[PDB]
Amino acid sequence: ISRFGVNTENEDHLAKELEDLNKWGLNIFNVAGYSHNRPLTCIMYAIFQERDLLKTFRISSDTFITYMMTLEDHYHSDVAYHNSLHAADVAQSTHVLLSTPALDAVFTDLEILAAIFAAAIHDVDHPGVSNQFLINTNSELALMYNDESVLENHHLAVGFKLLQEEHCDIFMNLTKKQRQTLRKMVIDMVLATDMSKHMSLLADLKTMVETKKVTSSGVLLLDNYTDRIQVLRNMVHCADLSNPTKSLELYRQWTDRIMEEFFQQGDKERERGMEISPMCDKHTASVEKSQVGFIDYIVHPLWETWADLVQPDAQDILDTLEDNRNWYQAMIPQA
Ligand SMILES: CCn1ncc2c(NC3CCOCC3)c(-c3nc(CC(=O)N4CCCC4)no3)cnc21
Ligand SMILES: [As]
Ligand SMILES: [As]
Ligand SMILES: [As]
Numbered sequence: 218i219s220r221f222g223v224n225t226e227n228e229d230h231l232a233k234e235l236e237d238l239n240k241w242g243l244n245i246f247n248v249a250g251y252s253h254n255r256p257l258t259c260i261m262y263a264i265f266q267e268r269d270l271l272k273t274f275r276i277s278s279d280t281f282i283t284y285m286m287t288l289e290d291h292y293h294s295d296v297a298y299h300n301s302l303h304a305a306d307v308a309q310s311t312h313v314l315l316s317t318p319a320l321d322a323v324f325t326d327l328e329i330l331a332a333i334f335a336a337a338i339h340d341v342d343h344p345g346v347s348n349q350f351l352i353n354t355n356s357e358l359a360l361m362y363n364d365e366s367v368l369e370n371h372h373l374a375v376g377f378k379l380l381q382e383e384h385c386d387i388f389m390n391l392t393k394k395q396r397q398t399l400r401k402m403v404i405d406m407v408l409a410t411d412m413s414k415h416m417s418l419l420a421d422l423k424t425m426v427e428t429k430k431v432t433s434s435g436v437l438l439l440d441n442y443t444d445r446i447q448v449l450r451n452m453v454h455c456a457d458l459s460n461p462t463k464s465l466e467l468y469r470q471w472t473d474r475i476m477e478e479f480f481q482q483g484d485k486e487r488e489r490g491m492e493i494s495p496m497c498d499k500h501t502a503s504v505e506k507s508q509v510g511f512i513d514y515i516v517h518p519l520w521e522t523w524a525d526l527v528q529p530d531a532q533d534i535l536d537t538l539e540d541n542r543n544w545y546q547a548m549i550p551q552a
């Protein structure tokens with residue numbers, strides 16, 4: 218499949234943008250434009266063929282498209298940030314981190330498959346409000362999940378429930394043991410995307426960079442499953458927290474989107490007479506200080522640490538982040 222719409226010019230434009238598939242500088246917004254709003258289906262199709270995953274796992278191209286298309290329809294188009302474009306961008310970004318030189322020959326194809334799928338499903342059906350909002354407003358979801366990783370459990374539930382129908386089941390020709398290991402890994406990684414778990418995750422990552430063992434040639438030695446899944450769960454977390462590491466032109470659009478989502482929640486809070494969460498207040502929160510604060514406290518320490526694990530591979534990402542931080546600081550009118 219070369220196009221999803223009526224415009225013949227787009228095949229070319231789409232195919233053009235997909236030349237950057239293996240690069241950090243891919244522009245998912247363009248992919249979205251040239252694919253009739255199917256950034257996730259298109260990107261995943263592209264990633265799977267690049268990695269020969271459909272052949273390696275005997276996934277019919279037809280079952281795959283129908284699954285992806287449906288996965289993608291389960292992202293809410295009326296949610297500013299947490300929609301299929303962010304899913305696409307996290308899938309693509311993980312695709313690039315998986316090919317980093319320092320992790321060469323390290324992961325099985327099942328593992329590579331799990332990480333890319335995890336990426337794709339990891340915010341599906343996101344309502345546009347935070348876990349704390351669902352908990353404080355007694356949502357059906359918080360009731361289902363008992364207030365623990367409410368959204369994350371949900372996203373996983375939806376992704377795997379979409380595989381039940383044979384016409385959608387992309388893992389049909391995996392072995393029971395393979396599916397078993399996939400589910401265990403995908404679950405681990407998506408749950409890892411819960412921000413509430415981030416310090417515990419960074420702590421444990423810092424404490425793997427300490428005992429790190431780069432083999433003679435250049436690649437990291439990860440022998441056991443426990444070290445391997447820890448990198449993957451951190452890679453997908455990085456991917457999700459990657460917007461500030463992209464070109465400024467992309468970071469700003471992402472930033473605009475998430476603030477729109479956050480202020481939509483503020484409005485819904487106010488509408489219900491709840492205490493308005495500070496970063497969700499359109500009347501008082503500085504968009505710019507939010508990003509400087511986000512980078513300084515969350516994104517830099519994570520990437521500073523990822524960059525360490527795989528150096529010098531991520532050095533260019535660190536330089537971009539540091540430049541992007543400074544751009545935002547410089548837009549704060551105060552010293
Ligand atoms: C565009 C730069 N960017 N990308 C993400 C993000 C962000 N929070 C994400 C929320 C979803 O989980 C991954 C992190 C924030 C941000 N996050 C928060 C804390 C917050 O309001 N949360 C709601 C639920 C989890 C954290 N405050 O600012 C700022 N810029 C971002
Ligand atoms: As495509
Ligand atoms: As289906
Ligand atoms: As908030």
Ligand SMILES: [Mg+2]
Nearest residue numbers: 339340368410
């Ligand atoms: Mg999430």
Ligand SMILES: [Zn+2]
Nearest residue numbers: 307339340457
């Ligand atoms: Zn996400």
